[PDB]
Amino acid sequence: HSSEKWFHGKLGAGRDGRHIAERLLTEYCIETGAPDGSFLVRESETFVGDYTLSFWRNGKVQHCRIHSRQDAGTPKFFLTDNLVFDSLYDLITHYQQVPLRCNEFEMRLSEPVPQTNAHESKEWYHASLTRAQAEHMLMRVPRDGAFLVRKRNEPNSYAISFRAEGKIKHCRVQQEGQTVMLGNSEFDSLVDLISYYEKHPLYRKMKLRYPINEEALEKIGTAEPD
Amino acid sequence: ELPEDPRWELPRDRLVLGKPLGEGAFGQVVLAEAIGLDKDKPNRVTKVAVKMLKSDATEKDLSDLISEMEMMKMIGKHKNIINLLGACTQDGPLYVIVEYASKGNLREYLQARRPPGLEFSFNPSHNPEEQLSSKDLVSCAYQVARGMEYLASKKCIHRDLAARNVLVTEDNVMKIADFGLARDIHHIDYYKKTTNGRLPVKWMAPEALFDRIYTHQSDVWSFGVLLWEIFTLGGSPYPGVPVEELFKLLKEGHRMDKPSNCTNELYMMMRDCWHAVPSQRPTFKQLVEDLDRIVALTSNQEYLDLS
Numbered sequence: 001h002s003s004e005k006w007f008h009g010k011l012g013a014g015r016d017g018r019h020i021a022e023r024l025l026t027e028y029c030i031e032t033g034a035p036d037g038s039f040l041v042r043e044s045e046t047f048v049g050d051y052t053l054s055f056w057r058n059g060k061v062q063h064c065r066i067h068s069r070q071d072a073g074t075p076k077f078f079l080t081d082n083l084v085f086d087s088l089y090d091l092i093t094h095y096q097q098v099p100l101r102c103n104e105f106e107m108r109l110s111e112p113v114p115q116t117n118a119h120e121s122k123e124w125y126h127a128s129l130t131r132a133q134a135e136h137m138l139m140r141v142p143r144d145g146a147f148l149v150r151k152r153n154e155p156n157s158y159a160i161s162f163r164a165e166g167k168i169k170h171c172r173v174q175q176e177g178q179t180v181m182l183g184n185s186e187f188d189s190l191v192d193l194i195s196y197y198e199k200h201p202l203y204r205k206m207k208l209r210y211p212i213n214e215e216a217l218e219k220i221g222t223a224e225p226d
Numbered sequence: 227e228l229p230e231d232p233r234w235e236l237p238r239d240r241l242v243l244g245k246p247l248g249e250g251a252f253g254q255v256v257l258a259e260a261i262g263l264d265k266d267k268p269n270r271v272t273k274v275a276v277k278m279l280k281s282d283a284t285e286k287d288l289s290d291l292i293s294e295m296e297m298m299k300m301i302g303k304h305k306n307i308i309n310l311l312g313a314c315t316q317d318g319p320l321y322v323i324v325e326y327a328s329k330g331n332l333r334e335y336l337q338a339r340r341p342p343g344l345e346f347s348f349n350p351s352h353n354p355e356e357q358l359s360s361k362d363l364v365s366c367a368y369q370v371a372r373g374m375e376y377l378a379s380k381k382c383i384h385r386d387l388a389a390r391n392v393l394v395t396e397d398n399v400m401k402i403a404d405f406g407l408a409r410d411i412h413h414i415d416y417y418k419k420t421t422n423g424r425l426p427v428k429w430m431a432p433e434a435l436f437d438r439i440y441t442h443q444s445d446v447w448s449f450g451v452l453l454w455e456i457f458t459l460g461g462s463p464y465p466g467v468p469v470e471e472l473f474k475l476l477k478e479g480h481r482m483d484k485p486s487n488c489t490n491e492l493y494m495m496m497r498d499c500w501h502a503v504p505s506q507r508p509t510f511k512q513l514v515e516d517l518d519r520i521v522a523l524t525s526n527q528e529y530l531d532l533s
């Protein structure tokens with residue numbers, strides 16, 4: 001099975017998965033000065049059901065189709081007709097040691113790539129929301145655990161707004177290059193950070209349980225108290 | 227009360243019924259909420275669809291629904307097949323609980339994506355972003371081929387492949403549904419209808435129509451008709467032709483015409499599926515592979531060629 005890692009899965013809730021993966025690898029590699037072979041495995045947009053191996057090679061991101069076949073009872077994965085594996089893992093593992101022979105030349109995949117855009121499609125994430133604008137949304141939700149994550153004007157920084165003990169409370173998150181810091185705490189990306197506190201307590205044992213948005217209000221939201 | 231199944235049986239009270247989603251002569255599907263479908267998540271509510279018999283259902287219909295439920299357990303999970311979630315078989319009405327397809331059946335999906343026409347515009351000018359492209363249409367045919375291919379590898383014939391039986395999910399994934407007429411032919415390699423009854427004639431192959439002979443070959447015929455349905459964006463097969471005359475038309479080598487705005491290869495694909503010699507029609511493995519190539523070629527998205 002796949003447990004995140006280079007495995008990003010669905011990108012953009014099924015929308016513009018290739019494009020989203022190109023900007024995710026470009027700006028990431030250009031900055032971090034990534035070596036050739038940097039990659040991620042995403043769901044295929046063109047061939048529904050199959051996968052795609054997207055990677056960085058000479059200032060350019062290229063995609064490779066990962067065929068899948070579930071006929072022999074056991075799933076099968078391959079990039080070529082002469083080599084097959086029982087899992088994406090054994091397949092990715094393999095092409096890390098052994099190169100990729102194509103028309104141009106060969107290439108061994110080097111290092112994974114984190115999910116830096118994963119939050120841009122999530123329900124709780126907002127790109128342009130004022131604090132009051134956010135407080136007003138959480139004001140219409142008379143509960144504890146409801147939350148959201150807005151991006152602030154200040155470069156590389158996001159706030160986490162939530163309802164603790166029946167009262168609005170906010171939290172500061174700061175982007176440090178390619179890692180997110182929640183005060184002293186450090187994570188790989190917003191989605192890895194929210195994922196964590198969706199289980200663990202974020203404040204007084206208050207955990208992020210109820211993402212909030214327009215439709216989320218159509219399910220809970222009334223008119224706002226104060 | 228019939229053989230319960232601890233594997234699928236779900237407490238009848240952990241299911242909250244909602245509004246209708248579609249009906250027929252004797253059968254109905256209704257939206258519902260399933261509490262704690264997964265044992266590790268006893269309080270997580272999952273939107274689902276529940277299939278059940280109508281008020282005027284007969285003994286016969288019940289056995290058909292039992293069968294339908296058994297078929298889905300024997301076929302297994304697949305990306306393009308609606309997956310079975312569970313059932314309520316004891317002390318009350320039989321409920322077959324299945325995955326919920328938020329965009330309905332393919333026929334409806336396609337029609338709601340049809341153009342306005344020249345000099346005409348839509349009101350209230352609905353989502354212009356969901357208007358399907360030629361790439362999206364091939365992708366739908368491909369997905370259904372992949373699901374049928376898997377079904378054939380499981381030695382099963384659907385016998386009721388039609389756009390009304392292909393469901394579309396939230397992210398636009400095709401899900402083959404309605405296995406009430408499906409049959410297992412693991413060793414025999416064919417099914418011969420003994421009794422009589424209701425049948426989707428406009429989708430049935432000659433031999434299944436006159437000789438009552440069903441195989442993967444007749445499913446492929448139905449798939450030819452499905453293709454026509456897709457490329458006409460929800461048209462009706464053999465429009466205006468009375469069923470009683472359909473018999474005469476088929477016996478004389480009549481095939482439907484090419485849907486406007488449809489390459490010749492895709493029309494040729496339909497023709498192959500409608501071949502008079504069953505053994506000459508493509509199998510689903512050939513349809514997936516052909517459709518694979520067309521999808522790769524229609525979507526001008528370049529990939530690494532490793533050969």
Ligand SMILES: Nc1ncnc2c1ncn2[C@@H]1O[C@H](COP(=O)(O)OP(=O)(O)CP(=O)(O)O)[C@@H](O)[C@H]1O
Nearest residue numbers: 247248250251252253255275325326327331390404
């Ligand atoms: N999971 C689902 N999600 C959304 N809609 C569904 C659905 N399952 C069925 N429907 C709706 O109900 C319709 C009929 O469902 P289905 O084909 O399973 O029953 P059926 O056609 O066998 C009834 P009958 O046996 O009386 O002819 C579908 O075409 C669709 O409109």
Ligand SMILES: [Mg+2]
Nearest residue numbers: 250390391404
């Ligand atoms: Mg039906």
